[PDB]
Amino acid sequence: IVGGYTCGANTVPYQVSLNSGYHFCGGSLINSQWVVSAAHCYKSGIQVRLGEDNINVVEGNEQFISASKSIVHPSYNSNTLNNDIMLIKLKSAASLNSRVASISLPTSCASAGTQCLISGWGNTKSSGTSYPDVLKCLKAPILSDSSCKSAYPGQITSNMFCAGYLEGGKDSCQGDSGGPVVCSGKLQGIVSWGSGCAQKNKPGVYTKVCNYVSWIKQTIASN
Ligand SMILES: N=C(N)c1ccc(/C=N/OCC(=O)O)cc1
Ligand SMILES: [Ca+2]
Incomplete structure (x- = not known):
């Protein structure tokens, strides 16, 4: 920004960081099990990090949850970025609170x-x-x-x-x-x-x- x-x-509290050994994209928590992000952020081995403020320091409110599946929009075109949206399912439900919310x-x-x-x-x-x-x-x-x-x-x-x-x-x-x-x-x-x-x-x-x-x-x- x-x-x-x-x-x-x-x-x-809905802001997430997508991590593949390092932060590489943001995302939005839409319920305890699903994150909306950009299709151009697709990759394998995503870990979703919730409750983050400083992304380089574990401060105590974080939840780190591996993605079980990623679903890129069926009409995503990576050349034009038309339909640049993807869903990421968490392998376990996040615990929703004041710091982690949909x-x-x-x-x-x-x-x-x-x-x-x-x-x-x-x-x-x-x-x-x-x-x-x-x-x-x-x-x-x-x-x-x-x-x-x-x-x-x-x-x-x-x-x-x-x-x-x-x-x-x-x-x-x-x-x-x-x-x-x-x-x-x-x-x-x-x-x-x-x-x-x-x-x-x-x-x-x-x-x-x-x-x-x-x-x-x-x-x-x-x-
Ligand atoms: N608002 C912008 N000008 C803007 C928005 C999104 C991007 C995304 N680039 O993807 C590569 C990456 O994120 O590492 C760049 C510029
Ligand atoms: Ca942190």
């Missing part, structure tokens, strides 16, 4: 102009590289679909939305991938892609979760 703020320990799926899509909360342990520099220890957060508005398409001509599908600041300076970044965009208390987006981070006229592009609720519900009902 570039140009954001320190969230505060366990104030984003986030609701939306019943309707979010509105242009709505301020959402984007979070992660990704790069904090728009140029250069610096990774934070503690979870970072950013308040950013959903952009109009026409400004989104204008920013990325030929690349924005109905399964994507832009959020952020056209002036630059504030954005999600590498390492935030797969993490939550929460608007009005619902998981509305997943950190997906962008041209660099916090660049002028290049806002963040996010998977439009409201399009996938049926698939999510069907998939979790059968796996």
Whole structure:
């Protein structure tokens, strides 16, 4: 997260870190057994880490649970990033508390102009590289679909939305991938892609979760 703020320990209790020997993506806990992340975060041997603040220090509230299965969206296209969403099932249910909690799926899509909360342990520099220890957060508005398409001509599908600041300076970044965009208390987006981070006229592009609720519900009902 570039140009954001320190969230505060366990104030984003649905935020997870995906670990394969090292943190590589974020994710969102949607119930005691399932995490929503980006399909471009897929790999084998994922361990899901819940209740994290400092990802490099065991502070006492963590739950580390191995993934038993990963399900990439059947129409995920890794070239265009269309349908950039995947479900990860935990091999055992998380214990839900104040520091580890699920986030609701939306019943309707979010509105242009709505301020959402984007979070992660990704790069904090728009140029250069610096990774934070503690979870970072950013308040950013959903952009109009026409400004989104204008920013990325030929690349924005109905399964994507832009959020952020056209002036630059504030954005999600590498390492935030797969993490939550929460608007009005619902998981509305997943950190997906962008041209660099916090660049002028290049806002963040996010998977439009409201399009996938049926698939999510069907998939979790059968796996
Ligand atoms: N909002 C952005 N500008 C943005 C969003 C997501 C990414 C993700 N890159 O994937 C590689 C990785 O995470 O290691 C980059 C930039
Ligand atoms: Ca920790």
